[PDB]
Design a protein around this nucleic acid. Sequence first.
RNA 1: AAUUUCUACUCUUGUAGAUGUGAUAAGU
DNA 2: CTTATCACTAAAAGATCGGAAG
DNA 3: CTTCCGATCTTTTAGTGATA
Length: 1227
Amino acid sequence: MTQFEGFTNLYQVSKTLRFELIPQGKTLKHIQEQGFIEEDKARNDHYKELKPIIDRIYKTYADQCLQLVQLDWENLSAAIDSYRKEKTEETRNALIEEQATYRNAIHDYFIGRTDNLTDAINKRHAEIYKGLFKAELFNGKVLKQLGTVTTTEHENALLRSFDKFTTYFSGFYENRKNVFSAEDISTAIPHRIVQDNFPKFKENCHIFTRLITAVPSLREHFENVKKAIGIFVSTSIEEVFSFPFYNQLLTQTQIDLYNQLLGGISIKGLNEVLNLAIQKNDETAHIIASLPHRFIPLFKQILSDRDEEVIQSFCKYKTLLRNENVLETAEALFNELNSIDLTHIFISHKKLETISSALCDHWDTLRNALYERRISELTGKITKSAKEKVQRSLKHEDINLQEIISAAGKELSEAFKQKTSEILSHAHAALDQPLPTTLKKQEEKEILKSQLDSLLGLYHLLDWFAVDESNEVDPEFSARLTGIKLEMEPSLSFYNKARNYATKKPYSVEKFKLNFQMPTLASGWDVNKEKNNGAILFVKNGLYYLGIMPKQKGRYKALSFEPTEKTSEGFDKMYYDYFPDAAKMIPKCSTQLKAVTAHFQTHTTPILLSNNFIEPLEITKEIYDLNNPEKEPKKFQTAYAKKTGDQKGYREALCKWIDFTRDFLSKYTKTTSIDLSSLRPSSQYKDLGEYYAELNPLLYHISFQRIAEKEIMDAVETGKLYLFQIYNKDFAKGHHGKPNLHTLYWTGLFSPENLAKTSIKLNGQAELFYRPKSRHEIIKDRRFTSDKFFFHVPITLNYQAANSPSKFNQRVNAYLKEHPETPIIGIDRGERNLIYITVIDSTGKILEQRSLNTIQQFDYQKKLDNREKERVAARQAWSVVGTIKDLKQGYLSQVIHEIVDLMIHYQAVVVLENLNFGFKSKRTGIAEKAVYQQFEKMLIDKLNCLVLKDYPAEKVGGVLNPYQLTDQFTSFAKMGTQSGFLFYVPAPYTSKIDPLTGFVDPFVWKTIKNHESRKHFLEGFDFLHYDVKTGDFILHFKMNRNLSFQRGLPGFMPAWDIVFEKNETQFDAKGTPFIAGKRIVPVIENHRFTGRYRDLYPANELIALLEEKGIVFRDGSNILPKLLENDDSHAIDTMVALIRSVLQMRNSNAATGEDYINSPVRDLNGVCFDSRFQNPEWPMDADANGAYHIALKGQLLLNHLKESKDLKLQNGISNQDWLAYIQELRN
RNA sequence: AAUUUCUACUCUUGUAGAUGUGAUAAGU
DNA sequence: CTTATCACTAAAAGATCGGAAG
DNA sequence: CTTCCGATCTTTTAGTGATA
């Protein structure tokens, strides 16, 4: 019995609020007089300049330490091979522990505990590892200790400039602890060495050994290219791809040399040699090309290397291009292209579509041309292996121009000669048109973009030829193309820089962190650390103040604020109390002091501690062995239970440690005032983590106390305290609407209900930033014209729960299995509606379908329509592109509220569109997969902690009890099918589909081009007849026919009754007349669509065609043999055109506005479904048709949960299963 | 067209929604 | 342009300065 | 007049659980 309102308080979530600080009183004058802001700006500059020096010393220590490892590597290779062959859990954990011990073994080199080094160098490396992550790297100790590093006097002087202030680097310090650690983190050098580079090197070795087993005739060729490249001259080819040589390959420059050997010098590499071998088309070419024939390069090592401004840069670029005469070289190359041999120069395969998009009319016509011409040149009968050989020989291989000019004819030799005679001419204009004076007028940006794109299209035409010498290419043409390529390669870089400059923003959001000459400013608010951190907050009359007390004449003037009776006028100051993360402080303040470990070496008696204790606390020896053992897993850790299985001694030691913790909690002078009667006794705890997760919320407390106003006023006036007012738009005097969500979090954090029972915790690690001025009347950009102080503070919501969600999917599947009647929301994008919603019931009937064009009754469809018009109205308009892309993000940010409101009201499971396994065209408003990915991520992050503004604080959904329905976001690929209530289903076969019987277009088209193909396609049907009672053409289709021309996705039923409906008038529910069965088809000119749309009436056109042919059909007889006997091309062409028009599900015309669907199949009731009927029980528009089938896919996933005994979904549903399920349920 | 920040407007010197900040790596 | 990491800290420990004593 | 011992400011430091 799990209620939907019980899906709250499951895991903590960390958020961060930001506010603006107004300097109250005359603290602005004090800050300006003392000059903190200029000093902090100079120090931020020094920190930015000092970061690469610390990176340099880390780099040289990493290289020096990695050059000494001689580890042996067969064991992890055996482990990963055992995983590859078995794929069981036992070998999986064996591989995991083998990777862990390899990372530990290589980390022993950094920490200097390696078994295979002597003691002196071990002590040297251990001292270096100790001294890297302390202040000893700043004063100059480890600089002399390393010896290798070279530092000039300026870098050294700015490196010692952080003296007595080193902790400014502290997070950065711990950031570098990510790199050198032995953990499984992706930024670890051991992880990069073991789990990333080594699998690629091992598989490189295996492909090399297998390919040298196949034939050794190219082993000498490998030796010659290794000698000619002059890379790794001290070793042969056989041992450079062996495992022990990886012990020399860990350094970055050796990785670079390995990559240079594999890829060549830009002189051929191994990949180019293999390409030359497989392109020869001898027996060795088939014996190697059927085999794996690639070596993927290794990853780089961590921390390793490899308006007038743009106007002047482009002016110098154009002047240098005019001096080099790149247009003259290009026109000379295009002139000599007309006479040289075309066999010796090749076209890169990556633009095999692109040439089809440029030199001809369709983006894949020349690919089909060369494929069918290779098929026509095949010797013997066509088989599967020969077809696959042809497909392989044309899929990823460069092709010379003679095959292009023979398959596609000589006509391209004119058209190509046309197109270059355009582009270089504009390039000539781009090298003749003068530079614009500024970039503030529209025409200046116009002429600038034209100057970029002509030369950019010239690059994109020069990318056509195969720049890689994978075939036999004469080197002088290669030299000329590469020279003119490298003369003007960076034009893409100036294009990107000009686009991002003209795109970004007109403001300067750059800010630097203020510190007020404090090492640890606003790191914590606790009243014992109130002196050093110097950050407090006051509350008065609903307003919130931040007080920062700086050091006075170089010393912390310990000003004390006195308690005051409440009704006296004054600020309210908190008394923050925290014992941070008791799992790590209870070791810290007991059994890990220097005194206790110094005593426990030479003694066995228990030790009594009486420092910061009200009574002497006793530490016996056994608890010291429990916390500090010989091995890494402690006795009371569950890793000991997993590794050994001795549960009895585990439970006894856990009880002893838990008793010691409970004894400790009552006598430390900070935690003595806390009530611990809320804890269950020691023996009732299953493990240790639950104890710490329940104990941690008990140790944090905020209590307000009244401070006299006069003392604060003289503290501000004197200069001992800097008082700022915390501000956003909700603390203004004219504020009367609903607040922002962060203001709701901030107000609910200091509510009395939260102060009594902590649900939101005010975290430490606050930051103060400063932003310069950035250079009734409503002034544009008021917040961006003045220098401003910002305040960034993190908070932790749902503090009473754990940190990790554990099995969120299991819990939500349990709730969904408990409740079968739960509705399903389906979300789907479309044309003429940006986002479309369909909330359906469990039985399949829709409950509410809507378009999300309108938000606050002032719809965004006209915004996208108008902005997309002005896109065209001024070219592409670099300026407007960004406004469109941000209006899309803002539209999605407003759509988030509508979706979570629908989910909350309907208590439903939402079902989104999976962006993998899918392709979406243009015209869908939001199309870009990155923008919708950002949407799905924003939705997951919003439903991670869902809170509504109008809800009460105490109720579920309020600030003190937010809704948590979705698991924490981790990756765009590790989502799977579900994340809590966020279900994902594959995109296609959801928009163009009959919503009542599930008919889909079974043929694959764009292959109806040859005449006998049309003959076989038309002969595939069973029979066509005419009915005079309804005046319709009934054509019968069997799914076992036209299998070569049908898609390979059979449905449930094999029968279909396609109907050409009488194209008469009809009435909807609203009485608006509409022609029944009419279709919309584009007009085609020069075998290409032109965008203009025309209306088609299939039955009337077929009547006209058949009476013009003189075919008698009023008897109800078959017409297909009555028309195929003449073998007329025009008749079969019109028949195919009418079949395509009839099978066209969607019909839209944005110029006139109508948009509908039309199923050409009679249902079980014999009617033909028309979405222009506007039946509320069926999808209104085509976007509703898409969203309803997305919701039905979610319903299918729900049923897949229901039949399964285990509480887990199936994976992504195959399309054949979806079609079978739909055509089984609906018929 | 006013915003801690973004989007979009002006009955209202503001409105409706969203907003995890800072830092460093790595991939294309 | 994405994917992974870490911090969200008070108290112990040690450097720094100033006063007392031989 | 120099050296040793006590206040003050800065800087390290401890580390729990659980599958995919």
